[model samples]
Target: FVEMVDNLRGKSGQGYYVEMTVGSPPQTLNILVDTGSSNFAVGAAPHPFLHRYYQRQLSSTYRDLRKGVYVPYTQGKWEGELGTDLVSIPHGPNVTVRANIAAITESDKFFINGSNWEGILGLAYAEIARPDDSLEPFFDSLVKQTHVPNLFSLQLCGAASVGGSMIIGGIDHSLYTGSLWYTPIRREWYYEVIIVRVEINGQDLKMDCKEYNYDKSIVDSGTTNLRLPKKVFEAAVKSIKAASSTEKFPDGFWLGEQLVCWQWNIFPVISLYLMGEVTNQSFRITILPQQYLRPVDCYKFAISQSSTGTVMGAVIMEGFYVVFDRARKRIGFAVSACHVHDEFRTAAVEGPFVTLDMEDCGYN
Candidate 1:
């Protein structure tokens, strides 16, 4: 019964790899598919915890690939145990190989506050003696050598997530309700994309979004909040006012005190219509929780708040399936659900908004 509750972690980023059974079969794993990283893993049972009883992995399967494999991040220093294991993703019925498995000992540092996740998927591409770039993620190295546009689509659902899968060597037809909005990627800096225009409250804010010319928009599932460049973020908040009763959540953003956010008694449905191939449609990812409209100063940047104004929130991903196709050099988005909603917020710049050296920040 490994079929009921299996997970898909990856070796790279951008959500690849296949399914892997965590607990004993027929035990109902309660697993989920992560779109952000490439490594597929599980919450090791024997992890040290605060209160709850740890089921503990007596001996099922959690492989080790990095017998000596070195993995790095964009920001801070990271060191962990590594191994290769067979992972069964959410949607796929197959058990794919997760080459590099890193058991996280430092979970308390992340914004997600991932107490539940046993580990994470580091999607950077390793260049031998060098770390990985965001776009050419590590997961790309493990997939079958096929060239027919294999897509890694993430249909992320909540605690009771249904129909989320990390399809490898192929694509799943059931995930989408319409055509895929395949956007053209640029420069390959995490597969950069031009925002040409970003509108808030019916007002066009292209001029303020110019920083994007140097730094393209991004889609990161690991982060629960949306990250935006300073200018675009400033224009958005100025355009849309928060709902009268929208109180910020404690887990919202780092600078929640300075940010102004609103909620959706009926939050507006925001769409990012990508130009170029498949221009007819746009991703109708929900724009909710009000706080998402906060300015760039609200997000935590590497060094200062005055530099690097980029936005990537759950609002762009929630209620939609985010597809990152490495083989085809493209990223696709399709509206998966209409009524679905999740946490949304813009990250605050931690320091001055000046460009700081993100070498140790895990940005690459």
Candidate 2:
């Protein structure tokens, strides 16, 4: 198994990152672990001080693919060239194994800037990869070339000094307790799943399950919070507003702004109903009150509204053991060991784990 640590900086959820070694004699770098996109590229010259960018000239094992690549995202984009090198996980059973099909960036726009991470390691399929689909993703290479399984499980620890863990090749049974709830992947591109119903504080939003169950919803670890369809988002916020005491409700906040309150225990639970393969059978994924509310900020609301398709982000996944079974084309969920916490699990260390001297974002 290979383990990746969570790099939760800023105020709340940021993302997970892992330490990777590349080239002969090995140069260690901290890489953001993402499942949303499939393209592994390091930052170029401009943002070099972050200690995460890759310097291809310094590595002897680097081989240029001589092809330009570009990836665009809502927040940023990465423009680089395809390259090959021995990428090592640096932890667990597969620590020294070499990975392939990585990128060496020429330029970036908010890609690796203003963050502690150096680069992104995409775990999704290669169909979304570019300059063309000749490259294999890090996880796929792990299974195909390194003799590992196509399964990986994540346990996100919230707000703690010690972060979480992403286990590759197998599941860490200790991180989660109980039987797994398996759902077949409706679409392989974004780890899409079928959601028949959604509830906030016990009231169903009455979403048309038939429309959402096909490809309207996905479970994305790369996203910080839940992004719902306009209708569903409005319904969910209305339900929360109704259940909440409006004594000092803020008439203003950004579309992505959050509200925090000291009296957070009064909030309600959000439930997502997933359709099972068997007729008349369904599974429920519960989002507790604490999972949706950020403490000491006057009750920060966790869900967000989006025109894009429904997304179950880290806010929901942090509470469960999420298993991405690529070979079976299915995903599984189970209550994690940190499920009972009022906040995200701080650290996933068994004994004593060294905390990095992380660059602070000046959050209180």
Candidate 3:
């Protein structure tokens, strides 16, 4: 039987995670479910940001493979000890699979302050996993041992409900009423896709598809924003500004260096036309104003920018129920039930808004 549950919890801006019981005697902790990378790791050593660390000494079944694992993301990185142990989800399949567990001994900004998750559960392919690809990912092990469908779906509920949901090894037909639109995965590693065109305010940017696919684009849940290339991001900001009020903003307003607000309404729907198997065959993925607006610290108007390719993060992912069909190597999307309603706040900067380090954190 397919194990489908809605216990996945997190905000749109912060990370999303699920309760996982690992090791013997069942040491349960919230593991941040990230589709951007592949490494089911937890804090094994005491760290300042983590409220608690996984005590390996308590688990008799724990195995120290004695290998070192290091993984770097767009935001953070970590170095950990490689090992294997029994793993299972609370509301998921009762069958327990001996899976890879990276016990993080040292990290750098991987766990942020005020964040709720104690560890990260990467959902991507084994290609991006630390050390080597010989290491099977957690989901890979689950599918192999349980003989379940090699697919999973994720929904981000924002702050509207208790939390979002995730369907492992099956699709939850009740989560969406619309047909699940498909986009063929270009690469096996990162769920990469090529964008043929982008439309804003009923007008296409008219840039070549290569611009959208600059280096490589992927649907990443770990990223916080719908990151775009500099050229595309500039066009998107200009398009939003054209439809916005005539209120003049500071020099670095669009870059998120300054916090400014005006009474101009009417934010256009941003459309991403993804290319399928063929060059011309494509599907559309769109997001509304509230979906892209960042109201946390600085009142930012637009989305994130990447030097490489587009990173369709939770900013746009929250609007749809995404299905990662690994068996067919295709990612699907449907209008999700987790859609949230939010009124754009007029409050000024909550604190000092720090600009992102584009040159360093540029790759998607």
Candidate 4:
């Protein structure tokens, strides 16, 4: 799967369109849906950054979109001008989510190598939304404006599709095979489960983990990482060491470096466990290059420094059907058909053992 960064959120290749209105005099623009992040905004279409790699002229659909919406995220604060207009969600056309578009003018911070996305749709499970008349979440706005609420569902095929989807009013049933593992949405409809334990290959870690706090996480399809605390990273490293062979980098997990270099024909199993789940699901994710291991800020992952200690980045989210059910307060984890196992068993020693048939889907 290809990776692209926007507003610090990772969007799958595909995305949806919506009709957004900002302020009394609405200025509308299409946005990408980023489950990885909670904030909502838009990109600067005319910013100098757009000229870097985006050569394709704005589509006719994009041209007619309203203007005047502007959003800026600086010094940890995000606020901007709002514009409104009609938008469309590709697959299910019956419904249109109301939106307040943000405009950007001179910011290079939001720029990235966008191979799969042209815009974003980042309005979901929140308590209060601006411009829209209610305290309901952005997803709720669509529910209020759409014909069918329970009918919509989203399953991003893979990373290649940068902006996977935001099925407006209902989900397309033809794509999904198994039942969705629905979870409860806390006050924010984001999962808030406690992580009492994290064991990797017969080892359990506690020191690096946060203590006595609500161990909550989101099944955000927008992100590409399986994020965990420092303890989880230490644990995963210890576990992967057993199956990992010597690499040229000496101490990095890069595909070209031999440790993760094997083709799909011979891949290793990577496992992770939730706080109270009865079964531990072991997934196979890619550790592409030394590049991904670098940490971003003093705390986040970037390309120059080592990860401070965040496990489960987008790497772990790849082959799973992460369910985010707002009606319920608990979270459910399910496997994805993209990488299916022959048997449905719990994780065991002698390495994470689950088999599957690899096809020429470009993952190899």
lDDT (Cα atoms) of all candidates against the true structure: 0.41, 0.65, 0.75, 0.37
Model 2 regions lying over 4 Å from their true place = 1-11, 46-49, 95-114, 160-162, 210-215, 246-248, 258-263, 295-299, 340-364
Estimate the lDDT of model 2.
0.65
lDDT of 1 by residue, 93-160 (tens): 34444344444333332212323333444442333212233223335535642342345556543221
Return the top candidate by lDDT: 3
Best-to-worst order by TM-score is 3, 2, 1, 4
Best by TM-score: 3
Better-scoring candidate (TM-score), 2 or 4? 2
Positional deviation of residue 183's Cα in model 1 after best superposition, in angstroms: 0.3
Instruction: Compose the digit string of candidate 3's lDDT tens values, residues 1-364.
Output: 2345577877546678888888898888888988888889998877877767789898888998988887776567899899998888887766788999999988887887876788988889989878888899899999989977899888776652237778887888777656777777777787786666678866988766577777778898877788888888888888877876555666587776777664424667787766554434556767777677766534565486788588888877778888999999888887776575445421110111122221222123
Would you give me the overall lDDT of model 3?
0.75
Model 1 C-alpha lDDT versus the unseen true structure: 0.41
TM-score of each: 0.60, 0.84, 0.88, 0.58
Span of ten consecutive residues with least summed lDDT in model 3: 346-355
Q: Across residues 186-208, which tens digit of lDDT does each residue of candidate 2 receive?
A: 66666777776666665877655
